[PDB]
Write an enzyme that holds these catalytic residues in place. Structure first.
Site, PDB file in Angstrom:
ATOM      1  N   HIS A 108      -2.829   2.657   8.428  1.00  0.00           N
ATOM      2  CA  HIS A 108      -3.951   1.849   7.968  1.00  0.00           C
ATOM      3  C   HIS A 108      -4.110   0.645   8.883  1.00  0.00           C
ATOM      4  O   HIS A 108      -3.121  -0.056   9.156  1.00  0.00           O
ATOM      5  CB  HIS A 108      -3.726   1.375   6.532  1.00  0.00           C
ATOM      6  CG  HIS A 108      -4.673   0.311   6.062  1.00  0.00           C
ATOM      7  ND1 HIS A 108      -6.048   0.444   6.044  1.00  0.00           N
ATOM      8  CD2 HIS A 108      -4.412  -0.922   5.576  1.00  0.00           C
ATOM      9  CE1 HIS A 108      -6.555  -0.698   5.544  1.00  0.00           C
ATOM     10  NE2 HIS A 108      -5.606  -1.573   5.244  1.00  0.00           N
TER      11      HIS A 108
ATOM     12  N   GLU B 128       0.832  -1.191   0.000  1.00  0.00           N
ATOM     13  CA  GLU B 128       0.000   0.000   0.000  1.00  0.00           C
ATOM     14  C   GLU B 128       0.876   1.255   0.000  1.00  0.00           C
ATOM     15  O   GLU B 128       0.388   2.349   0.324  1.00  0.00           O
ATOM     16  CB  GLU B 128      -0.968   0.020   1.157  1.00  0.00           C
ATOM     17  CG  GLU B 128      -2.039  -1.028   1.059  1.00  0.00           C
ATOM     18  CD  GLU B 128      -2.989  -0.934  -0.101  1.00  0.00           C
ATOM     19  OE1 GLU B 128      -3.856  -1.875  -0.167  1.00  0.00           O
ATOM     20  OE2 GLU B 128      -2.983  -0.040  -0.908  1.00  0.00           O
TER      21      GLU B 128
ATOM     22  N   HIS C 162      -7.269  -2.557  10.162  1.00  0.00           N
ATOM     23  CA  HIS C 162      -8.533  -3.194   9.928  1.00  0.00           C
ATOM     24  C   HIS C 162      -9.414  -3.079  11.175  1.00  0.00           C
ATOM     25  O   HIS C 162      -9.726  -4.018  11.895  1.00  0.00           O
ATOM     26  CB  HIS C 162      -8.332  -4.676   9.484  1.00  0.00           C
ATOM     27  CG  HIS C 162      -7.622  -4.742   8.175  1.00  0.00           C
ATOM     28  ND1 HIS C 162      -7.295  -5.951   7.604  1.00  0.00           N
ATOM     29  CD2 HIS C 162      -7.179  -3.797   7.306  1.00  0.00           C
ATOM     30  CE1 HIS C 162      -6.688  -5.736   6.428  1.00  0.00           C
ATOM     31  NE2 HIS C 162      -6.574  -4.427   6.211  1.00  0.00           N
TER      32      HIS C 162
ATOM     33  N   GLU D   6     -16.288  13.380  22.218  1.00  0.00           N
ATOM     34  CA  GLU D   6     -15.044  13.892  21.682  1.00  0.00           C
ATOM     35  C   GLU D   6     -14.881  13.880  20.176  1.00  0.00           C
ATOM     36  O   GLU D   6     -14.008  14.564  19.659  1.00  0.00           O
ATOM     37  CB  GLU D   6     -13.869  13.056  22.270  1.00  0.00           C
ATOM     38  CG  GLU D   6     -13.913  11.623  21.805  1.00  0.00           C
ATOM     39  CD  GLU D   6     -13.302  10.598  22.694  1.00  0.00           C
ATOM     40  OE1 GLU D   6     -12.568  10.906  23.663  1.00  0.00           O
ATOM     41  OE2 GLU D   6     -13.537   9.401  22.331  1.00  0.00           O
TER      42      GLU D   6
ATOM     43  N   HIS E  91     -13.235  -3.178   4.403  1.00  0.00           N
ATOM     44  CA  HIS E  91     -11.785  -3.308   4.440  1.00  0.00           C
ATOM     45  C   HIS E  91     -11.214  -2.639   5.685  1.00  0.00           C
ATOM     46  O   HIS E  91     -10.590  -3.309   6.523  1.00  0.00           O
ATOM     47  CB  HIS E  91     -11.167  -2.848   3.100  1.00  0.00           C
ATOM     48  CG  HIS E  91      -9.683  -3.096   3.037  1.00  0.00           C
ATOM     49  ND1 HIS E  91      -8.993  -3.199   1.832  1.00  0.00           N
ATOM     50  CD2 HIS E  91      -8.675  -3.234   3.932  1.00  0.00           C
ATOM     51  CE1 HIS E  91      -7.704  -3.360   2.079  1.00  0.00           C
ATOM     52  NE2 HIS E  91      -7.440  -3.408   3.411  1.00  0.00           N
TER      53      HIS E  91
HETATM   54 ZN   LIG Z   1      -5.827  -3.484   4.555  1.00  0.00          ZN
END
Ligand SMILES: [Zn+2]
Ligand SMILES: [Zn+2]
Ligand SMILES: [Zn+2]
Ligand SMILES: [Zn+2]
Lengths: 274, 274, 274, 274
Positions: B141, B117, B143, B171, B212
């Protein structure tokens, strides 16, 4: 030189904040903790103090706290990090003789300051000192997950919420017979929410902030943590039960009455009457 | 010799990846993390470098990143393992003077390469550098479980999703006033999904990949982790509430408006208007 | 001098209480654990004993326990803290020759006393000694979350509850073929609830306290913990299934019959007949 | 003398079993793990071997495994305890030259024996050796919570179950393109369930045991753990989604087709066709 990091109170602040982090109650900077100390607790560590302690005014005069030391969590600081760098994330403060402000004797390094919820903390300490004849020493705020979730689905009413929490684990009436106070949603970090919290603390050891979290008070870190843990455990049970379609049976009025009699507590009348 | 394993940035990458593993956000190789460094961070460790650093081309020219070092997670590597073998699972890379490729100065041993990525990471770093005048330094990133679940049940719309997340913990409007961008489902590991992510990053610090996971950006590892943790905490609360039949009450428009005023943030207009 | 803290039984009590704390079963002081020892276990540690052991009467005569040593958790003590200070939170007690009381040989410092559920523990040890010809040695109580939740939604009936738990993980019939006894709600900390528990223990190794928790018995700490963990795991599965609308398929009568035959156990008839 | 406890394979068995324990997948003795080694792995530790290795027959001849060493978990042993006493809870076995039995070279102390699911493990190793030309080396069984729960509510059909798991996290089609095989409920610990599992392993790397758990196969401990973790993560997401009333949108056929093309995998046709 002893080293104040290994004092009972720094270690206790590390344990409570770390445990609350592991519970999932304190993402980011979302929680705060203050513990009232005695001069005798800190006096042996005078040489650990900042040589030139910083002074910060209080939001309003608090003469009941004159000359009183506390250990506190810092504004914007993460409970997860307390164990990694206690002096960065905690401070020892001592309120001056007029109750107008405090000196930072230790910690809150790199210009950190006490939690932005200091009004709610210190004003609630004042009301709990009066309500408990000085026994209570801790105010803890966390973002207790299941309690938060319940504020979207239960009536935000002291009697209703207290009764459901009592029902959700047998110990709860014994742990918090005075019930759970609940405020309207209010903007955080203000003296309005702080005194509103303090007023509820006159009558209850737990106060809920809808869509936000919980405040608890007690005599020791473990007792206060355990108070919140108890309420949140019951909330966890309730979330499961409600997700399965609701109670088919539960603790009756009651049984609650018998429980209170056995343990010598007077249950909040309004919650019992339901 | 110092030892770069104990540098602030290697230690910080270990903490963030390990913490995300413990959260249940990063099964297998499912997450990736990149942190922009300064030459001054790595220069003291020149002798830790591979004597003969490997060169890898970028997917496309990225001249804004010329001469810029990063620490990155590796392709196919597990967040769980970062703490066990940092040099196997992380690398320090330095983008060359034309922005055409980078040298692996440290780590990514046994022919490992940066995350698949990397387009989404580096292109998003470019857009966040521009959007924040160089303040943001991290793209993360993961999950995040509850955020993923919500992408099957909430409208995949920036305004709708942002408003529900704002409602699910007080918040959130303060932490992410610009809201959460959400893409259509797209095939991962492509420059299409990478620039689509980067374009959303022009306007938001959080971007959702339906079915995802999530991307977040911020100035520091803790601030970026805490951003995602906040959004995921709200998502956790929402999943509970929705499982109990939905909100009976919630934070109102507004209350959100008052909150934003107090904290000096401008809430995303479209989410507020709902 | 050996040091009794590192004995198998102190270490085992630390492991079980700590593991139960990590499971979320033992908020505050909510759980208790007692293990029957042999004189040969403690005799090598005579010099670790309090020089002047305290004496406490039992609630009623228990002559079957005459001269029997136990290690026990303390009243008001937190499972979370056992690892931090075993001697504060645990004690070794030895019942006197008439079964009328016991001496605190080690631990329970600062005037702590054994758990307030000592009647339920010791009376259940008596019935399990008789039922198992002396094989069982542990009584464990915890606030197992999913089991508690199910007591609000399943019929509080031994056959019904046992059958659903059998269905919720294949191993359960093999682990607890005698099923799960369930009492009416009763006021805790009484000899009524203690002997009611002990009577159920004549026929079952697990006993449920509605709206409260579970008791289990077994020969070793691990076997007893594992018994409760098994039942609670099945309960966890059931809570998920019920939250998703209920079983569309499940383990049949059968299959349970075949399972019992293969593993040489006789399943509780009433639960099988359903 | 090196010390085999610190070998890569003993350490790896400790990591996988401990991690699975922390996931909540392996209450009591509920899971088992076997790893195929090479003679070169164990030969340096010959002096750690039992001087007089025990011999145990296999349930049936397995000539494909002749002369093959494995490290295995023991029958009745707890994953939680592997880290505390590897040699009590694990053993190294070497199948004899006829495939008729094995010697216990190390571990399985105090007359412990390999897991009662040895048929399912070793027969599945045989079929995975053939299916993968010797690449796969691990068979792992655990009681993965959400996967178990789904077996009560989803059709127990390979195509249906595979498609829902693919939908529940984008990576799943890439991680297990061959899908998930699912057996009828069968009595555990038998060669019937073992070869039934092995037959499914001809076509899939994951096999579900309804109302019980999962088996996975892969080349390394981490890859096999990660395979199961991926499937269980998707299952966790699905349980949340189903508890919130089901999918309003999901990954389409296509999107799955595009995903498979990009990553060069052929998705199980029957699951794709749905
Ligand atoms: Zn991922
Ligand atoms: Zn807060
Ligand atoms: Zn209890
Ligand atoms: Zn199993």
């Amino acid at each position: 030189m002893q080293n104040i990091t290994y004092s009972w109170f720094v270690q206790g602040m590390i344990k409570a904040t770390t445990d609350a982090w592991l519970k999932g109650w304190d993402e980011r900077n979302g929680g705060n903790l203050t513990l009232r100390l005695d001069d005798a607790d800190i006096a042996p560590y005078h040489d650990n103090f900042h040589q030139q302690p910083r002074y910060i005014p209080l939001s309003q005069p608090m003469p009941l706290l004159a000359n009183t030391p506390f250990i506190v969590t810092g504004s914007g600081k993460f409970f997860r990090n307390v164990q990694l760098d206690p002096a960065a994330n905690l401070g020892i403060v001592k309120v001056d003789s007029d109750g107008a402000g405090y000196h930072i004797l230790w910690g809150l390094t790199n210009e950190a300051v006490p939690t932005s919820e200091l009004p709610a903390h210190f004003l609630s300490h004042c009301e709990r000192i009066k309500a408990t004849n000085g026994k209570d020493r801790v105010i803890m705020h966390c973002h207790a997950t299941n309690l938060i979730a319940l504020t979207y689905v239960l009536e935000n009413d002291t009697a209703v919420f207290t009764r459901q929490l009592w029902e959700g684990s047998t110990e709860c009436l014994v742990v918090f017979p005075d019930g759970v106070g609940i405020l309207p949603w209010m903007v955080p970090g203000t003296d309005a929410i702080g005194q509103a919290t303090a007023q509820e603390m006159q009558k209850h050891s737990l106060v809920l902030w809808p869509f936000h979290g919980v405040f608890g008070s007690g005599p020791t870190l473990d007792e206060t943590f355990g108070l919140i843990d108890t309420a949140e455990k019951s909330a966890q049970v309730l979330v499961k039960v409600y997700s399965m379609g609701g109670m088919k049976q539960t603790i009756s009025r009651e049984e609650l009455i018998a429980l209170g009699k056995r343990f010598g507590v007077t249950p909040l009348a309004s919650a019992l009457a339901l």
